[PDB]
Design a protein around this ligand. Structure first.
Ligand SMILES: [Zn+2]
Lengths: 8, 46
C-alpha cells in the first residue's frame, strides 16, 4: 500500500 | 506526529490508519474505521 506519515 | 495515512487505490483519497499497522493495493473498503470505509466519504484534512 502507499503510505505517508504527517506530523500530527 | 506521526499520523499514518494510506491512499485508496480506487479513489486516490488519503485515509488515516491506526498507529502500528498492509496489502499491495488498499481501498477505502478495507478501512478499520467504518466512518471512512466508502470512497464517497470526503478526505480528512491534515
Ligand atoms: Zn476510496
Amino acid at each position: 500500500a502507499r503510505t505517508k506519515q504527517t506530523a500530527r | 506526529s506521526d499520523q499514518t495515512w494510506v491512499q485508496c487505490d480506487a479513489c486516490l483519497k488519503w485515509r488515516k490508519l491506526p498507529d502500528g499497522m498492509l496489502p499491495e493495493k488498499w481501498y477505502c473498503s478495507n478501512n478499520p474505521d467504518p466512518q471512512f470505509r466508502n470512497c464517497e466519504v470526503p478526505e480528512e484534512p491534515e
